[PDB]
Amino acid sequence: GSLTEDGLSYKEKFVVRSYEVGSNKTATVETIANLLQEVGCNHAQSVGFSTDGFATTTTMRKLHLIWVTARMHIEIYKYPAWGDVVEIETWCQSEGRIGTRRDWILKDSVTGEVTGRATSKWVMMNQDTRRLQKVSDDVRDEYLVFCPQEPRLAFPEENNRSLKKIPKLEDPAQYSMIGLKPRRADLDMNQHVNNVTYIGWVLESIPQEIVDTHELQVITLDYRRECQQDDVVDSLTTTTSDSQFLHLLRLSGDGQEINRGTTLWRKK
Amino acid sequence: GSLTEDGLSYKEKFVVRSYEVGSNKTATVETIANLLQEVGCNHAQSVGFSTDGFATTTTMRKLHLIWVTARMHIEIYKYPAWGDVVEIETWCQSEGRIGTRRDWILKDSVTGEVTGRATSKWVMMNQDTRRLQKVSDDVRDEYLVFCPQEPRLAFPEENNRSLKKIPKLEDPAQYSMIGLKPRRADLDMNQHVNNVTYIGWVLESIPQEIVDTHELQVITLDYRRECQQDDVVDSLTTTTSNDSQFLHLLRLSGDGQEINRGTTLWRKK
Numbered sequence: 001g002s003l004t005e006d007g008l009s010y011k012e013k014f015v016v017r018s019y020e021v022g023s024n025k026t027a028t029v030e031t032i033a034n035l036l037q038e039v040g041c042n043h044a045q046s047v048g049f050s051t052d053g054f055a056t057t058t059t060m061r062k063l064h065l066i067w068v069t070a071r072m073h074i075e076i077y078k079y080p081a082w083g084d085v086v087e088i089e090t091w092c093q094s095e096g097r098i099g100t101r102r103d104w105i106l107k108d109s110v111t112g113e114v115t116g117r118a119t120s121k122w123v124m125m126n127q128d129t130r131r132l133q134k135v136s137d138d139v140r141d142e143y144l145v146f147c148p149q150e151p152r153l154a155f156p157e158e159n160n161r162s163l164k165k166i167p168k169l170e171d172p173a174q175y176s177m178i179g180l181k182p183r184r185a186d187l188d189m190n191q192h193v194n195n196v197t198y199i200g201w202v203l204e205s206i207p208q209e210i211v212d213t214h215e216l217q218v219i220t221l222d223y224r225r226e227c228q229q230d231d232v233v234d235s236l237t238t239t240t241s242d243s244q245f246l247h248l249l250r251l252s253g254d255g256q257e258i259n260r261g262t263t264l265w266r267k268k
Numbered sequence: 269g270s271l272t273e274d275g276l277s278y279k280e281k282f283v284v285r286s287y288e289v290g291s292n293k294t295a296t297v298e299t300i301a302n303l304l305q306e307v308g309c310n311h312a313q314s315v316g317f318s319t320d321g322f323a324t325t326t327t328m329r330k331l332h333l334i335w336v337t338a339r340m341h342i343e344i345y346k347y348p349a350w351g352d353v354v355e356i357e358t359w360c361q362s363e364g365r366i367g368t369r370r371d372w373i374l375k376d377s378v379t380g381e382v383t384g385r386a387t388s389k390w391v392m393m394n395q396d397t398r399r400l401q402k403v404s405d406d407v408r409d410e411y412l413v414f415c416p417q418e419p420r421l422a423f424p425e426e427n428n429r430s431l432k433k434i435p436k437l438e439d440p441a442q443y444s445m446i447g448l449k450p451r452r453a454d455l456d457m458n459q460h461v462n463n464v465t466y467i468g469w470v471l472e473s474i475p476q477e478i479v480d481t482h483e484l485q486v487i488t489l490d491y492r493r494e495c496q497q498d499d500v501v502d503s504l505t506t507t508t509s510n511d512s513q514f515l516h517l518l519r520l521s522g523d524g525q526e527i528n529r530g531t532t533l534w535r536k537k
């Protein structure tokens with residue numbers, strides 16, 4: 001792992017592990033999601049940001065402010081197989097006072113070809129009250145120095161899947177996985193549920209026959225609210241179509257919305 | 269990752285990842301368990317065994333036989349922190365017609381000190397009928413060549429914790445975590461539940477206050493039956509004890525069929 005010559009992006013190589021693959025012997029979409037966040041943490045550590053908080057500036061800690069994921073978008077062309085080396089390059093960019101955006105390019109270490117790409121949208125929030133608030137000028141000066149000033153987008157294309165408004169799934173759902181609880185392995189170092197568990201919980205309502213005959217090409221996920229340690233989640237799916245699905249994660253009780261998203265699958 | 273000079277053991281170094289640690293910022297016991305199985309797979313791959321199954325010889329595939337975990341024993345002195353490099357050395361040894369044993373030594377890459385150690389007991393079984401059998405002579409000649417012939421035990425000691433008979437938890441249990449289902453992330457490449465998920469499911473019945481004030485020093489787990497994708501598990505715990513001991517039991521939430529039993533030992537922080 002290391003920063004590029006300009007110190008404006010970071011690269012890391014990962015060997016795919018035995019327990020990180022599914023039935024095809026290729027990395028799962030949660031393994032990829034985990035590698036994206038690990039290379040993101042390493043990029044922030046390599047530019048001065050200390051442990052406890054992810055990329056929280058000196059002003060952010062003083063004011064009890066954290067960066068939170070609002071959206072995650074992932075497109076995979078080829079899933080690296082068990083034993084293969086995947087090289088991921090990541091960088092962060094400012095989007096004015098709306099928030100910040102972090103992008104990734106997944107490549108095959110042997111061929112040099114792009115096998116996948118991802119984009120995430122982060123917003124600033126008070127860790128205690130959970131209130132959003134715009135990006136303050138004083139905090140911008142602190143992190144802008146680590147970001148390229150010119151646009152560098154993993155998803156440049158006019159009208160692409162990463163910015164499309166996601167609708168709310170209507171009842172009754174076509175498919176469903178009810179009673180999902182997180183365990184200690186689903187929690188991060190700060191005792192919150194890691195954003196990767198939501199990806200897995202969304203995919204639990206996808207029927208096994210679709211998973212066996214298709215490969216996940218695209219996934220877009222909107223994070224609305226966090227699931228607490230003692231909360232139970234219900235996963236709902238409906239085919240909207242390649243196969244497309246509209247997804248919805250909600251609390252098993254009150255029916256409070258925690259996540260919404262879409263997936264696109266290709267026939268093998 | 270590479271075999272030692274004699275080709276009778278294997279070593280690999282691992283950097284501890286951000287998502288692999290708990291509240292203390294040190295690797296969880298499931299992260300360690302995962303690293304032990306990964307270095308075990310890499311050792312078998314480096315000595316000729318194909319990707320298909322784990323260490324299944326040419327005769328084993330012909331007769332639809334596989335190696336299955338019967339017992340797992342793990343002792344941790346220091347949990348490596350996020351960013352630290354942990355070096356693990358592993359090897360396999362025969363235990364006559366009973367089956368095989370695989371051992372591991374966890375070390376700090378910087379200090380060279382032993383920070384942990386583990387031992388597992390494997391038995392031979394038919395893939396389809398699920399019936400156990402002794403290790404055949406023909407099968408033994410095929411894998412004995414990769415094992416040191418002299419004893420090499422991670423847990424040598426006269427009466428150590430790795431061989432102690434585990435009792436069955438009596439009802440009512442003191443603590444419990446009900447309704448545990450595996451998800452796709454809990455399954456391996458062959459669609460079975462990973463043996464590491466059982467470790468996590470056992471620890472779900474341990475109260476949060478014990479986890480917050482103590483560190484897991486020892487864990488012994490006996491694998492009796494596998495949990496299917498559509499099975500629901502119940503985790504039961506009872507304190508049996510400065511150190512805290514617990515008796516554990518995993519069973520199917522329906523019929524109450526026993527799938528796992530074990531013990532843990534925790535020391536105060």
Ligand SMILES: CC(C)(C)c1cn2cccnc2n1
Nearest residue numbers: 044055067092102122143146
């Ligand atoms: C490039 C640095 C490390 C300043 C940064 C800040 N970020 C906020 C949210 C997401 N990624 C981020 N990366």
Ligand SMILES: CC(C)(C)c1cn2cccnc2n1
Nearest residue numbers: 312323335360370390411414
């Ligand atoms: C050293 C080799 C690759 C022969 C081997 C066989 N095993 C059976 C059970 C557990 N580990 C094992 N390793």
